[PDB]
Amino acid sequence: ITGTSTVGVGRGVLGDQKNINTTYSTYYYLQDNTRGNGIFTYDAKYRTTLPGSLWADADNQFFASYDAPAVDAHYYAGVTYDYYKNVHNRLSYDGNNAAIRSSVHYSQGYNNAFWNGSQMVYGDGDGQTFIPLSGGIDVVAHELTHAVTDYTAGLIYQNESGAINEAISDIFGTLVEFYANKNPDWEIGEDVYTPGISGDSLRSMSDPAKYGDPDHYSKRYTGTQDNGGVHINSGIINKAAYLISQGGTHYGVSVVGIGRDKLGKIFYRALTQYLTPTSNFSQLRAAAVQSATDLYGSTSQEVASVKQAFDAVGVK
Ligand SMILES: [Ca+2]
Ligand SMILES: [Ca+2]
Ligand SMILES: [Ca+2]
Ligand SMILES: [Ca+2]
Ligand SMILES: [Zn+2]
Numbered sequence: 300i301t302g303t304s305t306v307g308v309g310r311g312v313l314g315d316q317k318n319i320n321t322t323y324s325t326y327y328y329l330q331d332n333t334r335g336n337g338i339f340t341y342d343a344k345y346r347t348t349l350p351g352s353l354w355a356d357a358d359n360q361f362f363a364s365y366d367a368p369a370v371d372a373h374y375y376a377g378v379t380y381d382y383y384k385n386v387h388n389r390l391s392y393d394g395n396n397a398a399i400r401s402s403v404h405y406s407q408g409y410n411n412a413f414w415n416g417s418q419m420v421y422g423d424g425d426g427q428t429f430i431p432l433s434g435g436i437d438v439v440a441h442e443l444t445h446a447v448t449d450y451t452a453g454l455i456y457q458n459e460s461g462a463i464n465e466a467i468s469d470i471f472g473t474l475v476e477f478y479a480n481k482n483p484d485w486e487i488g489e490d491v492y493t494p495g496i497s498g499d500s501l502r503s504m505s506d507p508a509k510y511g512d513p514d515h516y517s518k519r520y521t522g523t524q525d526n527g528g529v530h531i532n533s534g535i536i537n538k539a540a541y542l543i544s545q546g547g548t549h550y551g552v553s554v555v556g557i558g559r560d561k562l563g564k565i566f567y568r569a570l571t572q573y574l575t576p577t578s579n580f581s582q583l584r585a586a587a588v589q590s591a592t593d594l595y596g597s598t599s600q601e602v603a604s605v606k607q608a609f610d611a612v613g614v615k
Contacts, residue, residue: 300322300324300328300330300353301324302322302323302324302328302330303322303323303324304320304321304322304323304332304333305320305321305322305323305327305359306318306319306320306321306359307319307320307321307327307356307359307360307361308359308360308361309360309361309362309366309367309370310361310362310366310367310370311367311370311371311374311434312367312368312370312371312430312431312433312434312490312491313434313490317370317374319331319361319370319373319374319377320332320333320334320338320373320377321356321359323359326355326356326357327355327356327357327358327359328353328354328355328356329341329353329354329356329369329373330353331373331376331377333377334377334380334381334384334391334399335380335390335391335396335397335398335399336391336396336397336398337398337399338373338376338377338380338398338399338400338401339353339398339399339400339401340353340354340369340372340373340376340400340401340402340403341353341354341400341401341402341403342354342369342402342403342404343402343403343404343405343406343420344404345404345405345406345407346406347405347406349402349405349415349418349420350400350402350418351402351404354369354373365404367431367434368403368404368421368423368431368432368433368434369403369404369433371431371433371434371439372401372403372419372421372433372439373401375433375436375439375440376399376401376419376439376443378436378439378440378475378478378479379436379439379440379443379475380399381478382440382471382474382475382478383447386474386478386563387563387567389447392443392446392447392449392450393446393450394450399418399419399443400417400418400419401418401419401420401421401433402418402419402420402421403421403423403431403433404421404423405420405421405422405423406422407423408422408423408424408425408426409422409423409424409425410422410424410425410428410429411429411432412432412433412438412439412442413442413445414442414443414445414446414449416449419439419442419443421433424491426494427493427494427495428492428493429491429492429493430491430494431491432488432491434490434491435488435489435490435491435492436472436475436476436479436481436490437469437472437473437475437476437486437487437488437489437490438472438487438488438490438491439472439475440471440472440474440475440476441468441469441471441472441487442468442472444467444468444471444472445464445468447471447570448464448467448468448570451570451571451574452467452570452571452573452574452575452576452578453575453576454467454574454575454576454578455576455577456526456529457526457527457529458526458527458528458529458579459527459532459578459579459580460576460577460578460579461526461527461529462527462528462529462531462532462533462535462536462580463533463536463574463578463579463580463583464529465529465530465533466533466535466536466537466540467566467570469487469502469504469533469537470504470537470540470562470563470566471563471566471567472487473485473487473504474559474562474563477559485503485504485505485541485545486500486501486502486503486504486505487500487501487502487503487504488500488501488502489501502530502533502534502537503537504537504538504540504541505538505541505545506538507534507535507537507538508534512530512531512532512533512534512537513531513532513534513535514534514535514538514549514612515535515538515550515612515613516535516580516612516613516614517613518535519532519535520532535580535612535613535614536580536583536612538611538612539608539609539611539612539614540562540566540608542554542556542607542608542611542612543556543557543561543562543565543604543605543608544556544557544558544559544561544562546604548611549611549612550611550613552607552610552611553607553611554604554607554608554611555600555603555604555607556604557600557601557604561594561595561601564590564594565587565590565591565594565601565605566587566590568590568593568594569583569586569587569589569590572586572590572593573585573586573589573590574586580614581614581615583614584605584609584614584615587605587609588602588605588606591604591605
């Protein structure tokens with residue numbers, strides 16, 4: 300809407316207070332005009348019609364329980380926008396400052412969050428498996444990264460290309476979490492998953508096997524469930540990215556870590572310059588090796604480490 304840019308204050312899903320960019324026109328709307336062509340957050344009102352209503356508030360204060368998921372969806376979209384712009388010189392998900400839209404309170408007891416090809420959508424969870432999913436910065440960044448991928452490599456959401464698609468989202472979700480620097484880790488969704496259970500998460504990049512996901516190509520799922528196991532076989536690529544960054548010895552193969560920033564550069568370059576809709580794991584390895592070569596030279600530690608990592612997870 301047309302209005303004047305203002306700054307509201309509220310509390311997110313985890314009870315933390317934060318400032319949010321709003322727009323004033325009779326009501327204060329969750330519309331951040333400070334980033335690209337805007338970040339807009341909507342209320343789906345427990346229904347499944349999208350996007351729902353642009354979030355409107357009478358007093359620019361967002362401390363109600365019902366406000367929390369909106370506060371976080373709006374704020375974390377901003378953090379993710381900042382990451383891509385500051386770190387990768389990318390303006391929004393399309394590289395041309397596309398408006399970022401999110402709807403919260405999607406359906407009832409909905410234990411998921413997703414990019415639908417046009418916008419972000421967040422369930423509130425059922426309070427047992429999940430609390431409102433926009434509470435997880437890694438979740439927000441994971442799903443916005445699907446938009447980036449759709450505008451770039453366009454990895455088909457099935458089989459190996461789909462698992463790469465998922466891993467890319469886990470990788471950048473995690474790098475955004477580190478960028479925000481609040482309790483960062485190599486786990487996915489820990490902030491909103493199972494409020495009744497401490498120390499768990501949906502997936503682990505450092506040890507995918509913790510939740511029964513493969514950490515080696517020899518253990519890949521080849522059935523038809525989950526679009527050919529896109530959320531399962533992503534563990535193989537997640538483990539490789541973790542190894543590239545942090546190092547380690549995996550099934551007896553040693554990897555020299557090169558750190559998160561260089562991991563981010565290599566994979567962002569792979570995603571935007573080399574990967575295609577049909578890329579498989581072997582082709583991802585080649586793309587990452589070529590990216591690291593472009594960035595650091597063929598004789599670099601960075602290239603050697605990428606090779607070691609993919610070797611360690613059995614991807615040739
Ligand atoms: Ca209010
Ligand atoms: Ca964390
Ligand atoms: Ca995490
Ligand atoms: Ca938990
Ligand atoms: Zn996903």
